[PDB]
Amino acid sequence: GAMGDILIVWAKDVDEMLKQVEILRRLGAKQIAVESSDWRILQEALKKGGDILIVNGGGMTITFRGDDLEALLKAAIEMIKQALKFGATITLSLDGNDLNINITGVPEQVRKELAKEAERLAKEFGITVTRTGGGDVDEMLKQVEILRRLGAKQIAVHSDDWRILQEALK
Amino acid sequence: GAMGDILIVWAKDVDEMLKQVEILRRLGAKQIAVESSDWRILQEALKKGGDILIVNGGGMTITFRGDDLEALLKAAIEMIKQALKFGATITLSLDGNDLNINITGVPEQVRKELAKEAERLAKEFGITVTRTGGGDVDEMLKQVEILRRLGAKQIAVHSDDWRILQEALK
Ligand SMILES: [Cl-]
Ligand SMILES: [Cu+2]
Ligand SMILES: [Cu+2]
């Protein structure tokens, strides 16, 4: 189309992903890339006729959930300050009663510290937290091969994520 | 490669972009996509042999600059709270004495309010701010055609950005 060739959907939920893909198809979108740290969401994207995927190998998505948005933001702000100081790239969105934080470009030890801090902050502000991705390099290699077997034609990785993984491989 | 086909570089500076592309090429990367709200950075990415670009049509990159990181973070935190409340997707990184904020998925009026607030916060915390992108839909259509003329093969748009632009077109 006149504005570009590919639309990028950041998918945090399988049903929201399918709803978004459908809305874009009705608006005349022809190629939809799906980005998610959840391997099942990426597998579902392929099943629905997508073939461009953005994967998260060494990073993770932290999802804070709760009815008080100001509590979600206080928890998120602490994660943001720490993640940025460690040299992370962070993507944030509000999704209903959820605040989603994608974190890339930090080594395994730092990822572990940020995961622990997410748990601590969740308790402190009386909210819940779920973590997706941040598996080892071996699991990433396996899941990428599975996406390829299921018909992925183009797999993209954030360069900071890829650099950390290549250092972990060495 | 074993981890994927494409690496995504978020480029905020033309020299940093070229340095990153070179580091990845030396690590054995074969396809590098460049994402930036700066049309000249994307043109430079093509000149260096790239052909995959991620553009920002209706959104913008806000860059806070200053020697006190705690001042940069206070300004960024206010932008984050407001942007998220407006339904924005936000990407953040630290780059030397710079804090970069990519904002997508808000209409023109909201973008204008966030730009004004960035200026106000910069003054309040004794730091500087620069804005990139957030031009009208006509300028986006023109610059995408120019990228295509200069040899872009795949142009990607964030789905939230694209939805806002299609609403602006209508
Ligand atoms: Cl992306
Ligand atoms: Cu991303
Ligand atoms: Cu992006």
DSSP A6-66: EEEEE-SSHHHHHHHHHHHHHTT---EEEE-S-HHHHHHHHHTT--EEEE-SS-EEEEEE-
Q: Which of B4, B92, B155 sits opposite A90 (nearest CB)?
A: B92
CB B162 within 8 A of CB A3: yes
Residues of A in contact with B94 (CB under 8 A): 84-85, 87
- Helix residue ranges, H only, B37-158: 39-47, 69-85, 108-124, 137-149
> What is residue B87's three-state secondary structure?
coil
What kind of experiment solved this structure?
X-ray
Residues of B in contact with A157 (CB under 8 A): 3-4, 6-8
Q: Which amino acid is at A102?
A: N
Contact check, Cβ <8 Å, B89/A87: no
Domain assignments of chain A as residue spans, ordered by start: 7-56+135-169, 60-132
In the CATH scheme, what architecture does the domain B60-132 have?
A: 2-Layer Sandwich (3.30)
The residue length of chain B stands at 170
Residues of A in contact with B76 (CB under 8 A): 80
**Reported resolution, Å:** 2.0
Sheet holding A89-95, edge to edge: A128-132, A60-65, A98-104, A89-95, B89-95, B98-104, B60-65, B128-132
**Mutual orientation of helices A137-149 and A159-169 as an angle, nearest 10°?**
120
CB A49 within 8 A of CB A21: no
Q: Closest by alpha carbon to A85, among B73, B66, B9? A: B73
CA distance B2 to chain A (A): 6
CB B16 within 8 A of CB B96: no
Quote the CA–CA distance of A134 and A164 in Å, as a whole number: 12
How far does the centroid of ligand 1 lie from the alpha carbon of residue A83, in Å? 18
Instruction: Provide the CATH number for the domain formed by B7-56+135-169 in this structure.
Output: 3.20.20
How far does the centroid of ligand 3 lie from the alpha carbon of residue A73, in Å? 21
